[PDB]
Design a protein around this ligand. Structure first.
Ligand code: MG
Lengths: 100, 304, 144, 50, 50
Protein backbone atom coordinates (compact mmCIF):
# COMPACT_ATOMS: atom_id res chain seq x y z
CA UNK A 1 0.00 0.00 0.00
CA UNK A 2 2.10 2.86 1.32
CA UNK A 3 5.57 2.44 -0.19
CA UNK A 4 4.23 2.50 -3.76
CA UNK A 5 0.82 4.17 -3.70
CA UNK A 6 1.12 6.73 -0.89
CA UNK A 7 4.76 7.66 -0.24
CA UNK A 8 6.67 10.82 -1.18
CA UNK A 9 10.12 10.68 0.48
CA UNK A 10 12.36 8.28 2.39
CA UNK A 11 14.40 8.57 5.60
CA UNK A 12 16.78 5.61 5.77
CA UNK A 13 18.86 5.64 8.96
CA UNK A 14 22.50 4.51 8.86
CA UNK A 15 23.18 3.12 12.33
CA UNK A 16 26.19 1.01 13.30
CA UNK A 17 24.45 -2.35 12.74
CA UNK A 18 21.90 -1.16 10.17
CA UNK A 19 23.69 -3.06 7.40
CA UNK A 20 23.17 -6.41 9.15
CA UNK A 21 19.37 -6.23 9.19
CA UNK A 22 17.89 -8.10 6.24
CA UNK A 23 14.46 -6.46 6.46
CA UNK A 24 15.81 -2.93 6.10
CA UNK A 25 17.88 -4.06 3.11
CA UNK A 26 14.80 -5.68 1.54
CA UNK A 27 12.71 -2.52 1.91
CA UNK A 28 15.75 -0.54 0.71
CA UNK A 29 15.78 -2.64 -2.47
CA UNK A 30 12.05 -1.97 -2.78
CA UNK A 31 12.76 1.77 -2.50
CA UNK A 32 15.50 1.48 -5.12
CA UNK A 33 13.08 -0.26 -7.48
CA UNK A 34 10.36 2.35 -6.94
CA UNK A 35 12.94 5.09 -7.61
CA UNK A 36 13.91 3.29 -10.82
CA UNK A 37 10.18 3.33 -11.58
CA UNK A 38 9.45 7.01 -10.91
CA UNK A 39 12.50 9.09 -11.97
CA UNK A 40 11.04 12.32 -10.59
CA UNK A 41 13.06 14.50 -8.18
CA UNK A 42 14.56 12.27 -5.44
CA UNK A 43 13.27 9.71 -2.95
CA UNK A 44 16.17 8.68 -0.69
CA UNK A 45 17.67 10.91 2.02
CA UNK A 46 20.18 9.12 4.29
CA UNK A 47 20.96 9.99 7.91
CA UNK A 48 24.02 9.27 10.06
CA UNK A 49 24.21 9.17 13.87
CA UNK A 50 27.14 7.12 15.14
CA UNK A 51 30.74 8.25 15.53
CA UNK A 52 32.16 4.75 15.03
CA UNK A 53 30.62 4.58 11.54
CA UNK A 54 33.36 6.17 9.45
CA UNK A 55 32.18 8.16 6.44
CA UNK A 56 33.83 5.72 4.00
CA UNK A 57 32.78 2.38 5.54
CA UNK A 58 29.05 3.18 5.11
CA UNK A 59 26.65 0.73 3.46
CA UNK A 60 28.00 -0.21 0.06
CA UNK A 61 24.92 0.54 -2.06
CA UNK A 62 24.53 4.01 -0.48
CA UNK A 63 28.14 5.24 -0.83
CA UNK A 64 27.00 7.22 -3.88
CA UNK A 65 24.82 9.45 -1.65
CA UNK A 66 25.86 12.07 0.89
CA UNK A 67 24.33 12.47 4.34
CA UNK A 68 23.33 15.31 6.65
CA UNK A 69 25.36 14.94 9.83
CA UNK A 70 23.91 14.32 13.29
CA UNK A 71 27.09 13.28 15.13
CA UNK A 72 27.62 16.76 16.60
CA UNK A 73 24.22 18.16 17.62
CA UNK A 74 20.70 16.94 16.91
CA UNK A 75 19.26 20.47 16.75
CA UNK A 76 21.12 21.52 13.60
CA UNK A 77 20.31 18.20 11.95
CA UNK A 78 16.61 18.70 12.63
CA UNK A 79 16.90 22.30 11.40
CA UNK A 80 18.56 21.54 8.08
CA UNK A 81 16.36 18.49 7.53
CA UNK A 82 13.26 20.65 7.96
CA UNK A 83 14.40 23.55 5.81
CA UNK A 84 15.52 21.18 3.05
CA UNK A 85 12.07 19.58 3.30
CA UNK A 86 10.27 22.91 2.99
CA UNK A 87 12.59 23.90 0.14
CA UNK A 88 11.52 20.71 -1.66
CA UNK A 89 7.98 22.21 -1.82
CA UNK A 90 6.36 19.40 0.17
CA UNK A 91 2.68 20.21 0.92
CA UNK A 92 2.18 21.76 4.34
CA UNK A 93 -0.31 21.57 7.22
CA UNK A 94 -0.85 23.91 10.19
CA UNK A 95 0.91 22.64 13.33
CA UNK A 96 -1.03 21.12 16.22
CA UNK A 97 0.82 19.82 19.29
CA UNK A 98 -2.39 18.40 20.80
CA UNK A 99 -2.32 15.50 18.33
CA UNK A 100 1.30 14.82 19.31
CA UNK B 1 31.04 24.08 57.36
CA UNK B 2 29.83 27.64 56.68
CA UNK B 3 31.90 28.14 53.51
CA UNK B 4 29.00 28.34 51.06
CA UNK B 5 26.71 30.03 53.59
CA UNK B 6 29.23 32.77 54.38
CA UNK B 7 30.20 33.25 50.73
CA UNK B 8 26.63 33.66 49.48
CA UNK B 9 25.64 35.75 52.51
CA UNK B 10 28.40 38.31 52.02
CA UNK B 11 28.11 38.33 48.21
CA UNK B 12 24.35 38.91 48.58
CA UNK B 13 24.95 42.66 48.93
CA UNK B 14 26.28 43.00 45.36
CA UNK B 15 23.46 41.21 43.46
CA UNK B 16 25.46 38.56 41.59
CA UNK B 17 24.26 35.00 40.84
CA UNK B 18 26.69 32.16 41.52
CA UNK B 19 26.94 28.38 41.31
CA UNK B 20 29.29 26.09 43.26
CA UNK B 21 30.35 22.77 41.72
CA UNK B 22 32.52 20.22 43.50
CA UNK B 23 35.29 18.80 41.32
CA UNK B 24 34.46 15.17 42.17
CA UNK B 25 31.24 15.43 40.17
CA UNK B 26 33.22 16.70 37.17
CA UNK B 27 36.22 14.36 37.60
CA UNK B 28 34.53 11.11 38.57
CA UNK B 29 37.01 9.13 36.32
CA UNK B 30 40.42 9.47 37.95
CA UNK B 31 39.17 9.17 41.56
CA UNK B 32 38.94 5.41 41.18
CA UNK B 33 39.96 2.59 43.52
CA UNK B 34 42.85 3.40 45.85
CA UNK B 35 43.53 -0.26 46.73
CA UNK B 36 40.68 -2.16 45.03
CA UNK B 37 37.55 -0.36 46.28
CA UNK B 38 36.42 2.49 43.97
CA UNK B 39 35.92 5.75 45.83
CA UNK B 40 33.18 7.06 43.62
CA UNK B 41 30.63 6.12 40.96
CA UNK B 42 28.08 7.66 38.60
CA UNK B 43 28.07 5.11 35.75
CA UNK B 44 24.51 3.79 36.24
CA UNK B 45 23.15 7.32 36.78
CA UNK B 46 25.37 9.29 34.37
CA UNK B 47 22.77 10.63 31.94
CA UNK B 48 20.54 11.86 34.74
CA UNK B 49 23.41 14.07 35.93
CA UNK B 50 22.79 16.35 32.96
CA UNK B 51 19.10 16.54 33.84
CA UNK B 52 20.15 17.65 37.32
CA UNK B 53 22.34 20.55 36.16
CA UNK B 54 21.16 22.19 32.94
CA UNK B 55 17.69 23.39 33.95
CA UNK B 56 19.05 24.68 37.27
CA UNK B 57 21.58 26.83 35.44
CA UNK B 58 18.76 27.87 33.12
CA UNK B 59 16.85 29.24 36.11
CA UNK B 60 19.90 31.28 37.09
CA UNK B 61 19.94 32.70 33.56
CA UNK B 62 16.36 33.96 33.89
CA UNK B 63 14.36 31.11 32.37
CA UNK B 64 11.20 29.47 33.69
CA UNK B 65 11.35 25.65 33.31
CA UNK B 66 7.72 24.86 34.16
CA UNK B 67 4.81 26.55 35.92
CA UNK B 68 1.80 25.10 37.72
CA UNK B 69 -1.68 25.99 36.50
CA UNK B 70 -4.03 24.25 38.95
CA UNK B 71 -4.70 27.30 41.14
CA UNK B 72 -8.04 29.05 41.68
CA UNK B 73 -7.54 32.73 40.77
CA UNK B 74 -8.05 35.33 43.48
CA UNK B 75 -6.54 33.30 46.34
CA UNK B 76 -3.53 33.60 48.65
CA UNK B 77 -0.83 31.28 49.97
CA UNK B 78 1.99 31.62 52.50
CA UNK B 79 4.32 29.59 54.68
CA UNK B 80 6.56 29.95 57.70
CA UNK B 81 9.27 28.15 59.67
CA UNK B 82 11.46 29.16 62.61
CA UNK B 83 15.22 28.82 63.10
CA UNK B 84 17.73 28.73 65.96
CA UNK B 85 20.63 31.19 65.79
CA UNK B 86 22.04 30.70 69.33
CA UNK B 87 24.40 33.63 68.77
CA UNK B 88 24.90 35.28 72.18
CA UNK B 89 22.01 34.56 74.59
CA UNK B 90 21.03 31.33 72.78
CA UNK B 91 18.17 33.08 70.94
CA UNK B 92 15.62 30.97 69.09
CA UNK B 93 14.33 33.95 67.12
CA UNK B 94 14.64 33.56 63.35
CA UNK B 95 11.41 33.52 61.32
CA UNK B 96 11.77 33.51 57.53
CA UNK B 97 8.69 34.10 55.39
CA UNK B 98 8.59 31.48 52.67
CA UNK B 99 6.63 32.59 49.60
CA UNK B 100 3.22 33.62 48.24
CA UNK B 101 1.27 32.75 45.09
CA UNK B 102 -0.60 35.44 43.15
CA UNK B 103 -2.48 35.71 39.85
CA UNK B 104 -1.70 39.11 38.33
CA UNK B 105 -4.17 38.53 35.52
CA UNK B 106 -2.11 35.87 33.75
CA UNK B 107 1.18 35.29 35.61
CA UNK B 108 2.34 33.59 38.80
CA UNK B 109 4.44 35.30 41.47
CA UNK B 110 7.24 33.49 43.31
CA UNK B 111 9.17 36.18 45.21
CA UNK B 112 8.01 35.76 48.81
CA UNK B 113 8.70 37.89 51.86
CA UNK B 114 11.77 38.37 54.05
CA UNK B 115 12.88 39.93 57.32
CA UNK B 116 14.10 37.91 60.32
CA UNK B 117 11.85 39.26 63.07
CA UNK B 118 13.18 38.62 66.56
CA UNK B 119 11.77 37.33 69.87
CA UNK B 120 13.21 37.59 73.41
CA UNK B 121 12.33 34.00 74.38
CA UNK B 122 14.87 31.23 73.81
CA UNK B 123 12.94 27.94 73.84
CA UNK B 124 9.19 28.49 73.50
CA UNK B 125 9.12 29.54 69.80
CA UNK B 126 5.66 31.06 68.99
CA UNK B 127 5.79 34.81 68.29
CA UNK B 128 5.30 38.03 70.22
CA UNK B 129 2.08 39.87 69.30
CA UNK B 130 3.88 42.87 67.77
CA UNK B 131 5.76 41.10 64.97
CA UNK B 132 2.81 39.12 63.58
CA UNK B 133 0.76 42.20 62.68
CA UNK B 134 3.57 43.59 60.51
CA UNK B 135 4.26 40.10 59.15
CA UNK B 136 0.73 39.74 57.79
CA UNK B 137 0.44 43.41 56.79
CA UNK B 138 3.50 42.98 54.54
CA UNK B 139 1.80 40.25 52.52
CA UNK B 140 -1.28 42.48 52.51
CA UNK B 141 0.34 45.40 50.72
CA UNK B 142 2.21 42.98 48.47
CA UNK B 143 -1.16 41.57 47.39
CA UNK B 144 -2.58 45.07 46.95
CA UNK B 145 0.32 46.24 44.78
CA UNK B 146 0.46 43.07 42.66
CA UNK B 147 -3.35 42.90 42.38
CA UNK B 148 -4.37 46.59 41.99
CA UNK B 149 -7.22 45.63 44.37
CA UNK B 150 -7.72 43.78 47.63
CA UNK B 151 -7.16 40.05 48.18
CA UNK B 152 -10.17 37.76 48.54
CA UNK B 153 -9.13 34.53 50.32
CA UNK B 154 -6.02 33.70 52.35
CA UNK B 155 -4.30 30.44 53.35
CA UNK B 156 -1.37 29.93 55.73
CA UNK B 157 0.96 27.01 56.38
CA UNK B 158 3.00 26.36 59.50
CA UNK B 159 5.01 23.68 61.30
CA UNK B 160 3.75 23.92 64.88
CA UNK B 161 0.45 24.80 66.52
CA UNK B 162 0.30 28.12 68.34
CA UNK B 163 -1.55 29.87 71.14
CA UNK B 164 -4.70 31.99 71.04
CA UNK B 165 -3.34 35.53 71.43
CA UNK B 166 -1.30 35.77 68.24
CA UNK B 167 -4.00 34.20 66.06
CA UNK B 168 -6.43 36.68 67.62
CA UNK B 169 -4.01 39.45 66.62
CA UNK B 170 -3.93 37.95 63.11
CA UNK B 171 -7.73 38.20 63.01
CA UNK B 172 -7.41 41.79 64.25
CA UNK B 173 -5.34 42.83 61.21
CA UNK B 174 -7.85 41.22 58.84
CA UNK B 175 -9.31 43.75 56.37
CA UNK B 176 -13.06 43.57 55.70
CA UNK B 177 -14.35 40.00 56.32
CA UNK B 178 -11.88 37.79 54.43
CA UNK B 179 -11.44 34.22 55.65
CA UNK B 180 -8.08 33.30 57.20
CA UNK B 181 -6.99 29.74 58.01
CA UNK B 182 -3.68 28.23 59.09
CA UNK B 183 -2.64 24.58 58.76
CA UNK B 184 0.04 22.81 60.81
CA UNK B 185 2.09 20.23 58.89
CA UNK B 186 4.41 17.87 60.73
CA UNK B 187 7.09 15.73 59.08
CA UNK B 188 7.47 12.40 60.92
CA UNK B 189 4.82 10.55 62.92
CA UNK B 190 4.89 6.74 63.13
CA UNK B 191 2.05 5.12 61.16
CA UNK B 192 4.08 2.35 59.54
CA UNK B 193 1.88 0.13 57.36
CA UNK B 194 2.52 -2.83 55.07
CA UNK B 195 1.11 -4.41 51.93
CA UNK B 196 -0.65 -7.74 52.47
CA UNK B 197 0.47 -9.43 49.24
CA UNK B 198 3.33 -9.13 46.78
CA UNK B 199 6.73 -7.56 47.36
CA UNK B 200 5.96 -3.87 46.76
CA UNK B 201 4.98 -1.03 49.12
CA UNK B 202 1.83 1.08 49.13
CA UNK B 203 0.92 2.87 45.90
CA UNK B 204 1.41 6.62 45.99
CA UNK B 205 -1.58 8.85 46.67
CA UNK B 206 -3.48 7.07 49.43
CA UNK B 207 -5.05 8.69 52.48
CA UNK B 208 -6.48 7.67 55.86
CA UNK B 209 -8.88 10.09 57.57
CA UNK B 210 -9.29 9.74 61.33
CA UNK B 211 -11.53 12.79 61.93
CA UNK B 212 -12.97 15.84 60.21
CA UNK B 213 -9.95 17.81 61.48
CA UNK B 214 -6.94 15.49 61.24
CA UNK B 215 -5.74 13.59 58.17
CA UNK B 216 -2.82 11.66 56.71
CA UNK B 217 -1.06 11.45 53.36
CA UNK B 218 1.52 9.19 51.73
CA UNK B 219 4.12 10.50 49.29
CA UNK B 220 6.77 7.76 48.90
CA UNK B 221 5.16 4.85 47.07
CA UNK B 222 5.87 4.08 43.44
CA UNK B 223 4.22 5.84 40.50
CA UNK B 224 3.06 3.32 37.87
CA UNK B 225 4.78 5.39 35.18
CA UNK B 226 8.08 5.13 37.08
CA UNK B 227 7.16 1.54 38.11
CA UNK B 228 9.83 1.76 40.85
CA UNK B 229 9.79 2.84 44.48
CA UNK B 230 10.67 6.37 45.58
CA UNK B 231 12.17 5.07 48.85
CA UNK B 232 14.41 2.08 49.45
CA UNK B 233 12.42 0.72 52.41
CA UNK B 234 8.75 1.01 53.39
CA UNK B 235 7.71 4.68 53.55
CA UNK B 236 6.64 6.99 56.37
CA UNK B 237 3.61 9.27 55.89
CA UNK B 238 2.83 12.88 56.78
CA UNK B 239 0.30 13.69 59.52
CA UNK B 240 -1.93 16.72 58.95
CA UNK B 241 -3.77 18.70 61.62
CA UNK B 242 -5.98 21.75 61.09
CA UNK B 243 -5.50 24.20 63.96
CA UNK B 244 -8.10 26.95 63.45
CA UNK B 245 -10.46 28.37 60.85
CA UNK B 246 -13.20 26.74 58.77
CA UNK B 247 -11.38 24.83 56.01
CA UNK B 248 -12.59 21.78 54.12
CA UNK B 249 -10.15 18.90 54.52
CA UNK B 250 -10.15 17.44 51.00
CA UNK B 251 -9.49 20.67 49.09
CA UNK B 252 -6.63 21.76 51.34
CA UNK B 253 -5.19 18.23 51.23
CA UNK B 254 -5.21 18.13 47.42
CA UNK B 255 -3.76 21.65 47.34
CA UNK B 256 -0.84 20.70 49.59
CA UNK B 257 -0.32 17.55 47.52
CA UNK B 258 -0.26 19.63 44.31
CA UNK B 259 2.66 21.74 45.64
CA UNK B 260 5.25 18.97 46.04
CA UNK B 261 6.56 18.98 42.45
CA UNK B 262 7.81 22.59 42.21
CA UNK B 263 11.38 21.65 43.15
CA UNK B 264 13.25 23.90 40.73
CA UNK B 265 16.58 22.86 42.26
CA UNK B 266 16.10 19.33 40.85
CA UNK B 267 13.87 17.37 38.47
CA UNK B 268 12.76 14.31 40.46
CA UNK B 269 9.17 13.33 39.69
CA UNK B 270 7.99 13.36 43.31
CA UNK B 271 9.16 15.05 46.51
CA UNK B 272 8.17 14.26 50.07
CA UNK B 273 7.09 17.52 51.70
CA UNK B 274 5.64 20.60 49.98
CA UNK B 275 8.02 23.12 48.47
CA UNK B 276 7.11 25.86 50.97
CA UNK B 277 8.42 24.43 54.25
CA UNK B 278 11.73 23.15 52.87
CA UNK B 279 12.08 26.30 50.78
CA UNK B 280 11.87 28.61 53.79
CA UNK B 281 14.14 26.18 55.67
CA UNK B 282 16.80 26.46 52.96
CA UNK B 283 16.55 30.26 52.83
CA UNK B 284 16.91 30.60 56.62
CA UNK B 285 20.47 29.30 56.91
CA UNK B 286 21.53 31.76 54.20
CA UNK B 287 20.47 34.72 56.33
CA UNK B 288 21.65 33.20 59.62
CA UNK B 289 25.27 32.96 58.42
CA UNK B 290 25.92 36.65 59.16
CA UNK B 291 23.42 39.21 60.41
CA UNK B 292 24.97 42.53 59.33
CA UNK B 293 22.80 42.64 56.19
CA UNK B 294 19.98 45.19 55.96
CA UNK B 295 16.98 44.76 53.63
CA UNK B 296 18.14 41.74 51.60
CA UNK B 297 16.49 41.17 48.21
CA UNK B 298 13.25 39.24 47.75
CA UNK B 299 14.17 37.32 44.59
CA UNK B 300 15.18 33.71 45.09
CA UNK B 301 17.66 33.63 42.20
CA UNK B 302 20.43 34.96 44.44
CA UNK B 303 19.51 32.77 47.42
CA UNK B 304 19.39 29.68 45.21
CA UNK C 1 -14.95 -0.59 58.31
CA UNK C 2 -12.10 1.92 58.05
CA UNK C 3 -11.00 2.38 54.44
CA UNK C 4 -8.41 4.35 52.48
CA UNK C 5 -9.53 7.14 50.16
CA UNK C 6 -7.24 7.68 47.17
CA UNK C 7 -6.06 10.95 45.63
CA UNK C 8 -4.97 11.30 42.00
CA UNK C 9 -1.94 13.17 40.64
CA UNK C 10 -2.34 16.78 39.41
CA UNK C 11 -1.18 18.27 36.09
CA UNK C 12 1.42 20.91 35.26
CA UNK C 13 1.42 23.42 32.40
CA UNK C 14 3.94 23.73 29.57
CA UNK C 15 4.59 25.60 26.32
CA UNK C 16 1.99 25.88 23.53
CA UNK C 17 -0.71 25.43 26.17
CA UNK C 18 0.09 21.73 26.58
CA UNK C 19 -0.20 19.58 29.68
CA UNK C 20 1.48 16.53 31.21
CA UNK C 21 2.39 15.02 34.57
CA UNK C 22 6.14 14.47 34.28
CA UNK C 23 8.11 17.63 33.41
CA UNK C 24 11.02 15.95 31.61
CA UNK C 25 9.04 14.63 28.65
CA UNK C 26 7.15 17.93 28.45
CA UNK C 27 10.42 19.83 28.16
CA UNK C 28 11.61 17.29 25.58
CA UNK C 29 8.36 17.94 23.66
CA UNK C 30 7.34 21.58 24.07
CA UNK C 31 10.10 23.51 25.82
CA UNK C 32 10.04 26.42 28.26
CA UNK C 33 7.60 29.33 28.26
CA UNK C 34 9.82 32.42 28.02
CA UNK C 35 12.70 32.47 25.55
CA UNK C 36 16.05 33.74 26.85
CA UNK C 37 19.18 32.72 24.99
CA UNK C 38 22.25 34.24 26.66
CA UNK C 39 24.49 32.09 28.86
CA UNK C 40 27.67 34.17 28.62
CA UNK C 41 29.21 32.83 31.81
CA UNK C 42 32.21 33.17 34.09
CA UNK C 43 34.44 30.82 36.05
CA UNK C 44 37.25 30.87 38.62
CA UNK C 45 39.66 28.14 39.63
CA UNK C 46 42.83 26.43 38.47
CA UNK C 47 43.82 25.64 34.89
CA UNK C 48 43.08 21.92 35.23
CA UNK C 49 39.64 23.12 36.28
CA UNK C 50 39.53 25.15 33.06
CA UNK C 51 40.27 22.17 30.83
CA UNK C 52 37.96 19.82 32.73
CA UNK C 53 35.13 22.37 32.62
CA UNK C 54 35.68 22.87 28.88
CA UNK C 55 35.57 19.11 28.29
CA UNK C 56 32.40 18.67 30.32
CA UNK C 57 30.75 21.71 28.73
CA UNK C 58 31.33 20.65 25.14
CA UNK C 59 30.57 17.02 26.04
CA UNK C 60 26.91 17.68 26.95
CA UNK C 61 26.02 18.63 23.37
CA UNK C 62 26.02 14.96 22.41
CA UNK C 63 23.27 12.84 23.99
CA UNK C 64 24.25 10.75 27.01
CA UNK C 65 22.46 7.52 27.88
CA UNK C 66 21.25 6.27 31.25
CA UNK C 67 21.72 2.65 32.25
CA UNK C 68 17.95 2.05 32.51
CA UNK C 69 15.63 3.85 30.09
CA UNK C 70 12.26 3.01 31.66
CA UNK C 71 12.97 4.94 34.88
CA UNK C 72 14.96 7.91 33.50
CA UNK C 73 13.80 9.82 30.39
CA UNK C 74 16.49 10.39 27.79
CA UNK C 75 18.57 13.57 27.50
CA UNK C 76 19.13 14.43 23.81
CA UNK C 77 20.97 17.73 24.30
CA UNK C 78 20.84 21.21 25.80
CA UNK C 79 20.02 22.83 22.45
CA UNK C 80 17.77 19.84 21.73
CA UNK C 81 15.51 20.53 24.73
CA UNK C 82 15.82 24.23 25.59
CA UNK C 83 16.58 26.06 22.35
CA UNK C 84 19.34 28.03 24.09
CA UNK C 85 23.01 28.34 23.18
CA UNK C 86 25.76 27.43 25.64
CA UNK C 87 29.26 26.65 24.35
CA UNK C 88 32.85 26.48 25.59
CA UNK C 89 34.28 29.36 23.53
CA UNK C 90 32.92 32.51 25.25
CA UNK C 91 34.14 32.24 28.85
CA UNK C 92 35.80 35.16 30.62
CA UNK C 93 38.14 33.56 33.15
CA UNK C 94 39.80 35.27 36.11
CA UNK C 95 42.87 33.59 37.56
CA UNK C 96 42.90 32.11 41.07
CA UNK C 97 45.63 32.04 43.69
CA UNK C 98 48.07 29.18 43.14
CA UNK C 99 50.68 29.53 45.90
CA UNK C 100 48.10 28.65 48.58
CA UNK C 101 50.42 29.63 51.43
CA UNK C 102 48.10 27.61 53.70
CA UNK C 103 49.51 24.10 54.16
CA UNK C 104 49.52 21.32 56.77
CA UNK C 105 51.71 23.57 58.93
CA UNK C 106 48.70 25.90 59.32
CA UNK C 107 45.65 24.08 60.68
CA UNK C 108 44.80 25.79 63.98
CA UNK C 109 41.64 27.93 63.80
CA UNK C 110 40.34 26.71 60.45
CA UNK C 111 37.73 29.49 60.70
CA UNK C 112 40.50 31.91 59.68
CA UNK C 113 41.38 29.70 56.71
CA UNK C 114 37.74 29.73 55.60
CA UNK C 115 37.66 33.52 56.03
CA UNK C 116 40.77 33.91 53.86
CA UNK C 117 39.35 31.60 51.17
CA UNK C 118 36.02 33.43 51.01
CA UNK C 119 37.61 36.89 51.11
CA UNK C 120 39.89 35.99 48.20
CA UNK C 121 37.10 34.50 46.09
CA UNK C 122 34.64 37.30 46.81
CA UNK C 123 37.10 40.13 46.14
CA UNK C 124 38.20 38.51 42.88
CA UNK C 125 34.60 38.12 41.71
CA UNK C 126 33.65 41.66 42.77
CA UNK C 127 36.68 43.23 41.09
CA UNK C 128 36.02 41.29 37.88
CA UNK C 129 32.36 42.36 37.84
CA UNK C 130 33.07 46.01 38.68
CA UNK C 131 36.06 46.78 36.46
CA UNK C 132 35.85 44.71 33.28
CA UNK C 133 33.64 45.42 30.25
CA UNK C 134 32.17 42.05 29.22
CA UNK C 135 28.65 41.24 30.41
CA UNK C 136 28.70 38.07 32.52
CA UNK C 137 25.56 36.21 33.58
CA UNK C 138 26.59 33.41 35.97
CA UNK C 139 29.73 32.58 37.94
CA UNK C 140 30.86 28.98 38.41
CA UNK C 141 33.21 28.11 41.28
CA UNK C 142 35.14 24.82 41.33
CA UNK C 143 37.55 23.66 44.03
CA UNK C 144 38.78 20.29 45.42
CA UNK D 1 22.40 30.31 -21.68
CA UNK D 2 25.89 30.62 -20.21
CA UNK D 3 25.10 32.84 -17.22
CA UNK D 4 26.09 31.12 -13.96
CA UNK D 5 29.54 31.38 -12.39
CA UNK D 6 31.16 28.43 -10.63
CA UNK D 7 33.25 28.85 -7.47
CA UNK D 8 35.44 26.11 -5.98
CA UNK D 9 37.30 25.97 -2.67
CA UNK D 10 38.50 23.69 0.13
CA UNK D 11 35.68 23.06 2.60
CA UNK D 12 37.31 22.14 5.95
CA UNK D 13 39.69 25.13 6.18
CA UNK D 14 38.03 28.16 4.55
CA UNK D 15 34.27 28.68 4.19
CA UNK D 16 33.81 32.24 5.43
CA UNK D 17 35.67 33.78 2.48
CA UNK D 18 33.56 31.78 0.01
CA UNK D 19 30.34 32.67 1.83
CA UNK D 20 31.21 36.37 1.85
CA UNK D 21 32.08 36.29 -1.86
CA UNK D 22 28.84 34.51 -2.72
CA UNK D 23 26.78 36.99 -0.70
CA UNK D 24 28.54 39.99 -2.25
CA UNK D 25 28.17 38.66 -5.80
CA UNK D 26 24.48 37.86 -5.31
CA UNK D 27 24.09 41.34 -3.84
CA UNK D 28 25.53 42.87 -7.01
CA UNK D 29 23.13 40.61 -8.94
CA UNK D 30 25.40 38.09 -10.67
CA UNK D 31 24.10 34.53 -10.38
CA UNK D 32 26.33 32.30 -8.26
CA UNK D 33 26.75 28.54 -7.89
CA UNK D 34 29.09 27.02 -5.31
CA UNK D 35 29.36 24.13 -2.85
CA UNK D 36 26.71 25.46 -0.42
CA UNK D 37 23.90 26.39 -2.87
CA UNK D 38 22.91 22.95 -4.14
CA UNK D 39 20.20 20.45 -3.27
CA UNK D 40 20.58 18.89 0.18
CA UNK D 41 21.32 15.58 -1.56
CA UNK D 42 22.89 15.22 -4.97
CA UNK D 43 22.41 12.27 -7.27
CA UNK D 44 26.05 11.38 -6.54
CA UNK D 45 28.93 13.12 -4.78
CA UNK D 46 30.18 14.61 -8.06
CA UNK D 47 28.00 13.79 -11.10
CA UNK D 48 25.77 16.81 -10.41
CA UNK D 49 28.58 19.37 -10.24
CA UNK D 50 30.22 18.18 -13.46
CA UNK E 1 35.14 -10.96 0.50
CA UNK E 2 37.24 -9.77 -2.44
CA UNK E 3 37.03 -5.97 -2.80
CA UNK E 4 37.96 -5.72 0.90
CA UNK E 5 40.19 -8.76 1.47
CA UNK E 6 40.84 -10.55 -1.85
CA UNK E 7 41.35 -7.83 -4.47
CA UNK E 8 44.65 -6.46 -5.78
CA UNK E 9 44.11 -4.60 -9.07
CA UNK E 10 41.16 -3.09 -10.96
CA UNK E 11 40.33 -3.07 -14.68
CA UNK E 12 37.53 -0.57 -15.24
CA UNK E 13 36.73 -0.02 -18.92
CA UNK E 14 35.22 2.89 -20.88
CA UNK E 15 32.60 2.12 -23.52
CA UNK E 16 30.25 4.66 -25.11
CA UNK E 17 27.63 3.75 -22.48
CA UNK E 18 29.82 3.03 -19.45
CA UNK E 19 29.29 6.51 -18.00
CA UNK E 20 25.51 5.92 -17.90
CA UNK E 21 25.61 2.58 -16.02
CA UNK E 22 25.08 2.64 -12.26
CA UNK E 23 26.87 -0.62 -11.43
CA UNK E 24 30.25 0.46 -12.78
CA UNK E 25 29.94 3.86 -11.08
CA UNK E 26 29.15 2.20 -7.75
CA UNK E 27 32.07 -0.19 -8.18
CA UNK E 28 34.50 2.63 -8.97
CA UNK E 29 33.24 4.61 -5.97
CA UNK E 30 34.01 1.60 -3.78
CA UNK E 31 37.36 1.31 -5.57
CA UNK E 32 38.25 4.92 -4.74
CA UNK E 33 37.22 4.39 -1.11
CA UNK E 34 39.43 1.30 -0.83
CA UNK E 35 42.28 3.11 -2.62
CA UNK E 36 42.07 5.88 -0.02
CA UNK E 37 42.08 3.20 2.69
CA UNK E 38 44.99 1.24 1.18
CA UNK E 39 47.20 4.35 0.65
CA UNK E 40 48.28 3.12 -2.78
CA UNK E 41 47.37 4.84 -6.06
CA UNK E 42 48.14 1.75 -8.18
CA UNK E 43 44.69 0.20 -8.02
CA UNK E 44 42.54 0.99 -11.10
CA UNK E 45 43.75 0.70 -14.69
CA UNK E 46 41.21 2.35 -17.02
CA UNK E 47 40.58 0.86 -20.45
CA UNK E 48 39.52 2.55 -23.69
CA UNK E 49 38.13 0.31 -26.43
CA UNK E 50 35.66 2.12 -28.69
MG1 MG F 1 22.35 25.43 44.09
Amino acid sequence: KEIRENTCKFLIVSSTAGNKREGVLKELAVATKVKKHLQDDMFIIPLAIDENLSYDDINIEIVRLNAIDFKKSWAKGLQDLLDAFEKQNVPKKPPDHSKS
Amino acid sequence: AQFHDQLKARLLEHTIPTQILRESTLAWRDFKNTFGAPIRDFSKIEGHLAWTISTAAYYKAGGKPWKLGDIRPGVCYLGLVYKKIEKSKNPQNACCAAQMFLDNGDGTVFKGEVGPWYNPEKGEYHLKPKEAKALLTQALESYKEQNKSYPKEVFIHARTRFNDEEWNAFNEVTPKNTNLVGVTITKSKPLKLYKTEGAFPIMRGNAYIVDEKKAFLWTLGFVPKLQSTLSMEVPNPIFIEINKGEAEIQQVLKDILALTKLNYNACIYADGEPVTLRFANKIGEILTASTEIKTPPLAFKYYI
Amino acid sequence: MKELIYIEEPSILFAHGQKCTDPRDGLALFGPLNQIYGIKSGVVGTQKGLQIFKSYLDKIQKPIYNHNNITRPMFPGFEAVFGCKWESQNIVFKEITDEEIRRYLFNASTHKRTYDLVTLFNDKIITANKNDEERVDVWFVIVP
Amino acid sequence: MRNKIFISHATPEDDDFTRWLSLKLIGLGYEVWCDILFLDKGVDFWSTIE
